[PDB]
Design a protein around this ligand. Structure first.
Ligand SMILES: [Ca+2]
Ligand SMILES: [Ca+2]
Ligand SMILES: [Ca+2]
Ligand SMILES: [Ca+2]
Lengths: 145, 791
């Protein structure tokens, strides 16, 4: 279903949810991250999502569970539209570009502790054409690296 | 280089030293205090550089071996941290004082639902893991506890049952009812041994039973392998079961006269052993002079702060009352006990008319025994000295004949009957105890096992052989379960494909118990020969197993005390815990305890109904095997957790860690076997949080700000670590043996190389951090959608 590399990337995503590092995601941990990315699910909508997938029955999501929770039947056109809404999460105002205070906006929300000189450096690394901002072309190059 | 090692020390177990010379098989050690000494290479172990380090899980050590374990638990014991893990195995050192706070209701509540890694080490965490696995897997659980008698095992079980009943029970105090009955179980199943005043001589499995909603409904005591040989004979520093002495010391003169009791020097079944009572200055004054044996009068009482024959008799009587044992059932128990004692005094003499007669001096013993057991004296006289046999064996029509017994066969019939009666009485006491917390039904249980551990002395006989056999089998069960847990952990952590090379002890087990060719069947074969002999049995073992890895003649022992033991006078078995030299004198007589059918029928139809109710071809070694296998079948049908109880010294003293003694227990308990098993996998591992806190001081601030996992991914990637030795798991970095120490040296040995390697990881790390938040955005969107899938 997912390839070798794509599984490896979602494990690091998984780490963003599992803040306390016990290898398990709780309902509380699951909502925070969705929230911090501009989302509003109810304590009913999430628990229903956990239970459908909580095979081993222990009331928390492990990495195997997490992945099945990602997955669903869909077309190669609906899947790469996810990639574009992802690309649209960073761009707060919506002008086609992630600024330092914007790429920084996801960070603080996500709980990444950095400095402005660090932010500015992440930008510089993804900028293939040399302009100084990140295009969907680049995004996908980076994400898929 | 000049690194600290651990080398042997005769009272601390190990001491710190430096290697100053090498030899073919040994190393020359300089104690950190120039009195060098030699040590075998395999008794010298690498030491943690930080001698004041204390970790909660020994798997966090940079070297995991018997010496570093011993030291970690020593450091923790000096801070009153009595509990320490090795993975999920709990090590528990008896404090010998009441530790404030750790057993309170608040502490109980803090352990509920918490994973084992997330709280400090504690018996409660082991109780709670058992519970959660029971509830979630719909699987009964065993908590398997090792340790010497007195190593804190009793208190440990109490804490488990208290945790389970108070947490998951409904106001009903099963734990207290089980505990109120202990004086009765100990009276019938415990005895003084050469090392332990209050040694349990049976396997005891204390079960808390649960309904389908995982709430406590009741308890059951399962019991196994009562030591039968002690009923009739003991060595000189040992006693029979406590009940015999409590009864003689403490029974009123009225009960004494009725049961015809007298001091214990007057009973064969007591008088080869120590006939002295446990008493202090005051209780000695409460024992009538006619209860006191000559050894008691010459040598005085045995001293123990928590055991007293006179007072324990009263305590036992109080507990029989507190749990419903009425006074008539009390005297019924006592009547059977004294019946067995008088049975043992019956002697026999060769007839020469054929067979034997009861000596005439045994007429009162016979009179007393038959009355107490409710049997016709003449019927008993005949069934003790004669048996019935059919005139054929293979289907042809036969006749019942009477066959007179020789004296030796009559001694065996009297002792066989003694053993069957006492064993059925024990079985009765336990069933009666279980009638104090009965339950209609249950779906699962959590049980705590307590059974005699592996042991050896200067002289090891058949008793030790059976005990060490039992422990060899429990150790295989322990190894299997740890192997399975570790394989499972490595899979859950995403470590990939890996075989943990397992050297099994099936071969030792097969040596003892294999059909036809095992030591126990060869011992049964000796019974069938014209002139059974221990020496012929023993030569047969050596003949059949010439080439066996786990067997040697005594001559080959390292020890001097075995120098002059002949090939046909003993054997050495290489057990999990080390080599044991068994002297085989009396193995054959100890392998027989059969009760011929007429005598057993006699007792089964006693005049007395209590005796009748008690009672409603196979060697001792094979009955042992059979019952042990029933114990194992039970354990094998449960999830297993493991506790190792440790006695810190032999003087009941707080704050006194005796190293060699604790080392020897770690070996005998199977912990060292487990550590050897763990060297085949990844025995050292550390959480990202632990690694982040140890090593952030060496990194640029840029890195110090990363979360612990990305900090470690960065450091791991920057160093170019060999993919075989180091494994980056889900929640921990896993190391092959010694490889965490090697990681630490890389981190310490060349700051400029390190700085450059970290410089060069910059790009990879910028990207990894892109992808983290990126794919975390993509994950929030996929979740958002999965809620939309309802459409
Ligand atoms: Ca978590
Ligand atoms: Ca789960
Ligand atoms: Ca923008
Ligand atoms: Ca660009």
């Amino acid at each position: 279903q997912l390839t070798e590399e794509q599984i490896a990337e979602f494990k690091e995503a998984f780490s963003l949810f599992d803040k306390d590092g016990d290898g398990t995601i709780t309902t509380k941990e699951l909502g925070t991250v969705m929230r911090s990315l501009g989302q509003n699910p109810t304590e009913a909508e999430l628990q229903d999502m956990i239970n459908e997938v909580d095979a081993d029955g222990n009331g928390t999501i492990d990495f195997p569970e997490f992945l099945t929770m990602m997955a669903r039947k869909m077309k190669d056109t609906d899947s790469e539209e996810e990639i574009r809404e992802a690309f649209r999460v960073f761009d707060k105002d919506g002008n086609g570009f992630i600024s330092a205070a914007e790429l920084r906006h996801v960070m603080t929300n996500l709980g990444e502790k950095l400095t402005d000189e660090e932010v500015d450096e992440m930008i510089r690394e993804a900028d293939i054409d040399g302009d100084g901002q990140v295009n969907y072309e680049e995004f996908v190059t980076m994400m898929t690296s | 280089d000049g690194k600290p090692v651990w080398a042997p020390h005769p009272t601390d177990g190990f001491q710190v030293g430096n290697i100053v010379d090498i030899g073919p098989d040994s190393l020359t050690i300089e104690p950190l205090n120039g009195k060098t000494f030699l040590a075998l290479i395999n008794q010298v172990f690498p030491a943690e550089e930080d001698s004041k380090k204390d970790v909660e899980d020994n798997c966090s050590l940079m070297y995991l071996n018997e010496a570093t374990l011993l030291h970690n638990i020593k450091v923790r014991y000096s801070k009153d941290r009595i509990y320490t893990y090795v993975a999920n195995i709990l090590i528990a050192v008896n404090p010998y004082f009441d530790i404030p706070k750790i057993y309170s209701s608040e502490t109980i509540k803090s352990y509920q639902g918490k994973s084992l890694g997330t709280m400090p080490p504690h018996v409660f965490a082991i109780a709670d893991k058992a519970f959660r696995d029971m509830k979630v897997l719909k699987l009964s659980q065993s908590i398997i506890v090792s340790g010497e008698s007195g190593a804190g095992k009793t208190e440990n079980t109490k804490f488990v049952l208290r945790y389970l009943t108070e947490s998951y029970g409904t106001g009903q105090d099963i734990d207290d009812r089980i505990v109120e009955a202990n004086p009765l179980l100990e009276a019938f199943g415990n005895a003084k041994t050469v090392r332990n005043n209050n040694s349990s001589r049976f396997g005891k499995f204390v079960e808390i039973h649960f309904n389908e909603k995982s709430s406590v409904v009741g308890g059951f005591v399962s019991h196994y392998l009562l030591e039968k040989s002690r009923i009739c004979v003991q060595g000189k520093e040992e006693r029979n079961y406590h009940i015999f002495y409590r009864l003689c010391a403490g029974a009123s003169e009225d009960i004494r006269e009725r049961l015809h009791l007298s001091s214990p020097d007057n009973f064969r079944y007591l008088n080869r052993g120590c006939t002295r009572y446990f008493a202090n200055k005051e209780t000695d004054k409460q024992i009538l002079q006619n209860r006191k044996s000559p050894e008691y009068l010459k040598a005085g009482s045995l001293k123990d702060p928590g055991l007293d024959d006179h007072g324990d008799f009263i305590r036992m009587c109080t507990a029989m009352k507190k749990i419903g044992l009425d006074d008539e059932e009390k005297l019924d128990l006592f009547r059977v006990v004294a019946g067995v004692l008088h049975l043992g005094n019956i002697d026999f003499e060769e007839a020469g008319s054929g067979g034997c007669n009861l000596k005439n001096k045994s007429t009162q013993a016979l009179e007393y025994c038959a009355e107490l057991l409710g049997l016709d004296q003449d019927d008993l006289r005949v069934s003790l000295t004669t048996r019935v046999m059919l005139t054929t064996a293979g289907g042809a029509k036969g006749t019942v004949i009477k066959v007179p017994l020789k004296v030796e066969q009559a001694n065996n019939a009297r002792d066989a009957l003694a053993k069957t009666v006492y064993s059925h009485l024990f079985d009765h006491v336990v069933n009666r105890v279980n009638q104090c917390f009965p339950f209609e039904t249950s779906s699962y249980f959590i049980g705590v096992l307590d059974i005699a551990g592996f042991e050896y002395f200067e002289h090891n006989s058949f008793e030790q052989f059976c005990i060490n056999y039992c422990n060899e089998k429990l150790q295989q069960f322990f190894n299997e379960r740890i192997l399975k847990e570790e394989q499972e952990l490595y899979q859950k952590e995403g470590l990939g494909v890996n075989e943990v090379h397992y050297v099994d002890n099936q071969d030792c087990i097969d040596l003892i118990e294999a059909r036809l060719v095992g030591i126990l069947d060869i011992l049964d074969e000796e019974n069938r020969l014209p002139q059974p002999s221990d020496q012929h049995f023993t030569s047969a073992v050596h003949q059949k197993h010439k080439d066996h890895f786990r067997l040697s003649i005594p001559r080959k022992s390292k020890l001097a005390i075995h120098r002059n033991i002949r090939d046909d006078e003993g054997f050495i078995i290489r057990h999990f815990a080390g080599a044991v030299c068994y002297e085989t004198t009396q193995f054959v007589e100890k392998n027989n305890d059969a009760l011929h059918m007429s005598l057993e029928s006699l007792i089964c139809e006693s005049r007395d109904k209590f005796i009748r109710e008690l009672f409603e071809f196979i060697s001792v070694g094979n009955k042992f095997k059979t019952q042990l296998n029933l114990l194992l079948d039970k354990l094998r049908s449960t999830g297993a957790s493991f506790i190792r109880c440790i006695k810190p010294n032999l003087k009941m003293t707080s704050h006194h860690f005796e190293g060699a003694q604790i080392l020897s227990q770690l070996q005998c308990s199977g912990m060292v076997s487990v550590l050897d098993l763990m060297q085949g996998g990844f025995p050292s591992r550390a959480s990202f949080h632990e690694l982040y806190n140890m090593y952030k001081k060496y990194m640029p601030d840029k890195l110090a700000r990363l979360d612990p996992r990305l900090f470690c991914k960065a450091l791991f990637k920057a160093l170019g670590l060999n993919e075989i030795d180091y494994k980056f798991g889900l929640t921990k970095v896993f190391f092959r043996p010694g490889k965490f120490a090697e990681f630490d040296q890389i981190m310490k040995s060349d700051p400029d190389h390190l700085a450059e390697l970290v410089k060069r990881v910059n790009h990879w790390l910028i990207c990894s951090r892109w992808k983290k938040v990126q794919w975390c955005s993509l994950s929030v969107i996929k979740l958002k959608n999965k809620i939309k899938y309802r459409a």
